[PDB]
Design a protein around this nucleic acid. Structure first.
Ligand SMILES: [Mg+2]
Ligand SMILES: [Mg+2]
Ligand SMILES: [Mg+2]
Ligand SMILES: [Mg+2]
Ligand SMILES: [Mg+2]
Ligand SMILES: [Mg+2]
Ligand SMILES: [Mg+2]
Ligand SMILES: [Mg+2]
Ligand SMILES: [Mg+2]
Ligand SMILES: [Mg+2]
Ligand SMILES: [Mg+2]
Ligand SMILES: [Mg+2]
Ligand SMILES: [Mg+2]
Ligand SMILES: [Mg+2]
Ligand SMILES: [Mg+2]
Ligand SMILES: [Mg+2]
Ligand SMILES: [Mg+2]
Ligand SMILES: [Mg+2]
Ligand SMILES: [Mg+2]
Ligand SMILES: [Mg+2]
Ligand SMILES: [Mg+2]
Ligand SMILES: [Mg+2]
Ligand SMILES: [Mg+2]
Lengths: 175, 201, 139, 190
RNA sequence: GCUGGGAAGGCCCGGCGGGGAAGGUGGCUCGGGGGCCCCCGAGUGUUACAGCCCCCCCGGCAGCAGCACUCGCCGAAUCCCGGGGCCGAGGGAGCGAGACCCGUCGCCGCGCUCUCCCCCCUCGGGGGGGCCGGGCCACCCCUCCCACGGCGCGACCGCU
RNA sequence: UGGGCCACUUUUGGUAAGCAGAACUGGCGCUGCGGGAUGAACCGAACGCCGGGUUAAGGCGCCCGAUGCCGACGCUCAUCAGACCCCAGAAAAGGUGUUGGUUGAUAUAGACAGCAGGACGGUGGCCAUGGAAGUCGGAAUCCGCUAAGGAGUGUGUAACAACUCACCUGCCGAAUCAACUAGCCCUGAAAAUGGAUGGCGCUGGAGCGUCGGGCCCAUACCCGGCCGUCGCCGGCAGUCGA
RNA sequence: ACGUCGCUUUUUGAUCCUUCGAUGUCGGCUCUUCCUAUCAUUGUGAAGCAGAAUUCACCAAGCGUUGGAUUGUUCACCCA
RNA sequence: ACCAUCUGUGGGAUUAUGACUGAACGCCUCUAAGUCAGAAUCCCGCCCAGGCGGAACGAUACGGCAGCGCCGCGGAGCCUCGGUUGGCCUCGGAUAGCCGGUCCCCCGCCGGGGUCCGGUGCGGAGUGCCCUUCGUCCUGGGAAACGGGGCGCGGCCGGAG
């Protein structure tokens, strides 16, 4: 699985009806996927391991994008995940701050890729929870819980380097 | 542009500047890079000196008089880098290489001109402040360039002369502002015309 | 040495992006790279925004962090940030740049003529001043 | 992990005047002027009080490596304060097994000659750093006093003497000759 | 057009309230910077001289994947206009008069006339309104069947 | 024609081999074209001669067409860095370099680290011997004073002694420790002509991981023109202006 | 030590890719350059380094690394 | 002809290594930032060669019509090579900061310090500035009239990389 800007999908599926059980149970999963197609694929992959279910021998009754309930409230996400490193499998718990659950998960995929060289197919999200600032544990997030937070941006590197490309004035960084 | 483009090599990264200059000279422009001893190189000085010592070791065993000519002067080093970025073995590449002039220090034809600066190549924006970097002048001097002293003294003298010229320029601007204060009444309408169209806030 | 600080209430000026050229107020801060930013009176609804497109101004507004847009607008309109920003030299320069760009050919002609005559007058005055300062001889 | 801010404060004594020319700290006191520029470190230096005269070093968004420069700058400034208030005196005791070491102080204590180290004919000649004064003690038998304001220069002069007095091709655990810095302290002991 | 018949959101200080906590408002205590009055930093907390989240007995209004660029999938639920570039292959299409000055022709889409009143410009020429009945839908009433979904009430059969 | 060879996967002999031999499919041979700097086999794609448009694989600092995006998030400093299937170079084992993660523990009843005290008695415990008094060893692991002190973690003496730690306390005020793990980097890491991420060079990246929008061209795909072939065993004897 | 991971192509093997319308096939003599896995010399750290002598390792290949009896020998051994 | 005799040389940055101050990690620490000493190595020197690389300087064509240099834009022209389609005549630089202006102190009437005042997403701004071409002729108001132009003559100064 690749990525993009992930969107969370509630995927509801079930086994196909059989004479043994004409009302097989329904199961819900939250799949953070680029689109509904990959969401269904990851859903089948996950329920194959969780239950004795198959894409062919079952069916998906629902696949709907879960909009963010509070996309304007800064909040802290704790993500329980497990992944296949180059020399085993390990469980990790990570902290993020984002306005969207899906954005927090995308940040998690990017951060795992940067810090542990892990690909999105290795990463396996198993819990995403909005948690309190007091329940935060990682200092990189804990340092942003301050009502009087204040900091300057010290070294503003000019990003319009090629416009103009040639000029008589040396750029000023302090702003 | 048809005019001769003059660059001040102080504070520019070597490859960053040479990459721009190669495209410029391939596009039919005339480029003059001055003060080539002031070009920086990213990475620490001992590492850069080791790299140049390795380039020194690369020579034709059979006859070094035919081998890779290791040019010691900073201007010649920058010129060689530009050559490496140019397709110098063709006629077009040779013409492009000939369109370039490189100088250690600033000769009299250019010390009375305005020197351009390439922001996309400057060390200030292409290097994080915590990284170490080396000066082409120190590196060249320590690998064989014999004129770090005379160039330093001549550059300081040119700095004094340009300081005097700048002092006179400041005096001229002071007089210009005083004259504007004098003829405010006479030029008040032209000032309004300029203001309405945005010149002269 | 620093005089402008990202904080709750600081007025930022957006330089690029879909909201370029508008003022906004910093409401909250996330991950060193983004800020919950909401400028109600300046037609920017609440959203996250990178610090790279912000240019802090010298105005600070007073409201609690992550307060609602109602209180943000109340503080903004009590401060009259629109008129103060219009009064500052930064917005004057931006306005002059815009009206310089929008100039037509006839306006360029008029600018040329006015500037020609104005520079003639100023240069003649400069020559007079140089004469006045040149008529000095006393060691 | 970029910590938002790391700041540290140093109190200036009353009889000391500290001026900031950018990142160049100029510390002036009864013993003179110590100047040092910290332009190799990107920090925010500021002077706060009017009677306390606090000096704050701030570093924003500093990772682990540069977070340690704040205490380094504060300690260097405190060293400057100590130098211009009480001065630095390094007492070195010249120890020898058999051959006495003839230490001769030349012009105004800026040159030290070690004559008979391990009973040889070569005379070591050591030039002290500028502003550093050497002396031969009176209350002690074989003792050298190195006085100055820059702790860097004083201790570097002491190291110059100590490493001039070096034994070669011998068991250094046996041959313990040389001059070693017995103690590091101040002048006026205030 | 659809979605959670979109999520949030903006205004009506949202009114009647409840609960909660801090990234703790005011106040109070402590220790500091400005000539017993102000600012800074450390504790207390439940609203105070800021606010935030959850539940409502209920909301109401505009707008609605926003011409305040927060976050989608599309078009029988889709159309109009404009610009740039490359190209011009083919060469007897006439069932009609019996072609003769010459296939402005096939299919497809339209306009006017062989009917008449008017309206508005123009000095005869332009721009318009139609012109009598039908159905079907929209409005009101009350009216049948079927399909689908949900809820209740039974008779049988089966699963205890 | 009846000498084959190569690649994924399977697979036999062999330490292994660009070795030798088998099975499946594809290719090279018989094959040009874009890409991998270069290359019989790898990736894309197969070819009449041209024009426009668009792609594939691969790229877009300069060589060298195209990121001259105000690209996004992080990681990493190398005094032998790194830089893309085949592929042109590396291992076990280490690091108090930095980052992330797991598990455990101490702590305002005062962590931890520093500076400062104490560090006792039966008992110079039993065998062991030349001397082993805590500290050469074989066994035992108790008691009281206690706040704590081990019949002992070390250094040391021939034995002692004398220092040291376990352990308690003082000063200090707020967090702290250890054991693992896997990312980059470093050590491990030595060959002969002078030399190779292709070169230049590159460190707010021209390196590494994960992603976005654009953009570049092949003989590939679409549209059009032309040539030839193949097919419709296609049409025309109706020149039938009557 | 028992084990275990490597490197090199100065040995000997393994294969037969290039050369059989020919690449003159051992050794010695002469002569130049290159490598370091350093024998000596420069600077060093360590030792069961007192001094002397010696042993291990580091930066390091600038300079040097010899005269002879026997043997076709490379190798081998001895004399100095 | 070591078979005779003579001569054979200095510096720098640094390696290993040993140190300084100083955190990280209220202790320590040669390292993280910043420093020091440091070698048959490296680089230059001394020595050899001297670029399809430059410098300064000298003399520069006859005794007979004979060559040449410089001055004139002096004219008339031939042949051949093509580009281009206003100019910018300049501080030094810092980037965890800059720039401009003013009153006191030094050093000969200006610069450098310190106080004060301004500006700073650089407007005393290269996203900038200067010039700006249809030409004349009547013909007025403004700027000016201490002006404008001489391929006009003669003089002085400055510039050496
Ligand atoms: Mg200290
Ligand atoms: Mg010895
Ligand atoms: Mg719409
Ligand atoms: Mg045609
Ligand atoms: Mg085989
Ligand atoms: Mg074979
Ligand atoms: Mg074939
Ligand atoms: Mg092929
Ligand atoms: Mg190719
Ligand atoms: Mg390759
Ligand atoms: Mg094409
Ligand atoms: Mg390429
Ligand atoms: Mg290009
Ligand atoms: Mg390595
Ligand atoms: Mg063969
Ligand atoms: Mg043959
Ligand atoms: Mg032959
Ligand atoms: Mg031969
Ligand atoms: Mg070695
Ligand atoms: Mg030699
Ligand atoms: Mg001789
Ligand atoms: Mg060191
Ligand atoms: Mg040194």
């Amino acid at each position: 699985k690749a990525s993009g800007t992930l969107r969370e999908y509630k995927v509801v599926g079930r086994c196909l009806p059989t004479p043994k059980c004409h009302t097989p149970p329904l199961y819900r999963m939250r799949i953070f996927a680029p689109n509904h197609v990959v969401a269904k694929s990851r859903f089948w992959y996950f329920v194959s391991q969780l239950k004795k279910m198959k894409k062919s021998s079952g069916e998906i009754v629902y696949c709907g994008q879960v909009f963010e309930k509070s996309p304007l409230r800064v909040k802290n996400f704790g993500i329980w995940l497990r992944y296949d490193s180059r020399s085993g499998t390990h469980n990790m718990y990570r902290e993020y701050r984002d306005l969207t659950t899906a954005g927090a998960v995308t940040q998690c995929y990017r951060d795992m890729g940067a810090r542990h060289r892990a690909r999105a197919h290795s990463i396996q999200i198993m819990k995403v929870e909005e948690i309190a600032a007091s329940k935060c544990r990682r200092p990189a997030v804990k340092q942003f819980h301050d009502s009087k937070i204040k900091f300057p941006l010290p070294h503003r590197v000019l990003r319009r380097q090629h416009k103009p490309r040639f000029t008589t004035k040396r750029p000023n960084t302090f702003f | 542009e048809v005019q001769v483009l003059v660059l001040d090599g102080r504070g520019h990264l070597l490859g960053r500047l040479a990459a721009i200059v190669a495209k410029q000279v391939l596009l039919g422009r005339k480029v003059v890079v001055v003060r080539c001893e002031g070009i920086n190189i990213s990475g620490n000085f001992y590492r850069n000196k080791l790299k140049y010592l390795a380039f020194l070791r690369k020579r034709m065993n059979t006859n070094p008089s035919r081998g890779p000519y290791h040019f010691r002067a900073p201007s010649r080093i920058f010129w060689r880098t530009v050559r490496g970025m140019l397709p110098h073995k063709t006629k077009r590449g040779q013409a492009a290489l000939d369109r370039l002039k490189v100088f250690d220090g600033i000769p009299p034809p250019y010390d009375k001109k305005k020197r351009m600066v390439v922001p996309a190549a400057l060390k200030v924006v292409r290097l994080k402040p915590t990284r170490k970097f080396a000066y082409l002048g120190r590196l060249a001097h320590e690998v064989g360039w014999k004129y770090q002293a005379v160039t330093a003294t001549l550059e300081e003298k040119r700095k004094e002369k340009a300081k005097i010229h700048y002092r006179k320029k400041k005096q001229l601007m002071r007089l210009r502002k005083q004259a504007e204060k004098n003829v405010e009444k006479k030029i008040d309408k032209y000032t309004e015309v300029l203001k309405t169209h945005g010149l002269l806030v | 040495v620093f005089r402008r600080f990202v904080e709750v209430g600081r007025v930022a000026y957006v330089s690029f992006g879909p909201h370029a050229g508008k003022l906004v107020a910093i409401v909250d801060v996330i991950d060193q790279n983004r800020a919950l930013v909401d400028g109600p009176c300046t037609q920017v609804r609440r959203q996250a925004m990178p610090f790279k497109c912000m240019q802090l101004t010298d105005f600070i507004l007073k409201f609690p962090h992550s307060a609602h847009q109602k209180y943000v607008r109340q503080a903004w309109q009590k401060a009259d940030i629109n008129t103060k920003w219009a009064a500052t030299r930064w917005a004057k320069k931006i306005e002059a740049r815009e009206r310089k760009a929008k100039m037509t050919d006839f306006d360029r002609f008029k600018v040329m003529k006015a500037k020609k005559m104005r520079n003639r007058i100023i240069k003649n005055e400069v020559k007079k001043l140089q004469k006045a300062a040149l008529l000095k001889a006393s060691p | 992990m970029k910590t938002i801010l790391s700041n540290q404060t140093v109190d200036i004594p009353e009889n000391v005047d500290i001026t900031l020319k950018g990142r160049t700290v100029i510390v002036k006191g009864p013993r003179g002027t110590l100047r040092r520029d910290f332009n190799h470190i990107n920090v925010e230096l500021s002077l706060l009080g009017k009677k306390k005269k606090r000096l704050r070093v701030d570093k924003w968004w500093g990772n682990r490596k540069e977070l340690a420069t704040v205490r380094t700058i504060c300690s260097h400034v405190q060293n400057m304060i100590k130098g211009v208030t009480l001065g630095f005196r390094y007492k070195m005791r010249s120890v020898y097994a058999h051959f006495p070491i003839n230490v001769v102080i030349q012009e105004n204590g800026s040159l030290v000659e070690i004559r008979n180290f391990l009973g040889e004919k070569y005379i070591r000649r050591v030039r002290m750093r500028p502003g550093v004064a050497c002396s031969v003690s009176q209350a002690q038998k074989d003792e050298l006093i190195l006085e100055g304001n820059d702790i860097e220069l004083v201790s570097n002069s002491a190291a110059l003497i100590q490493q001039a007095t070096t034994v070669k091709n011998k068991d250094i655990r046996k041959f313990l000759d040389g001059i070693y810095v017995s103690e590091k302290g101040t002048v006026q002991q205030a």
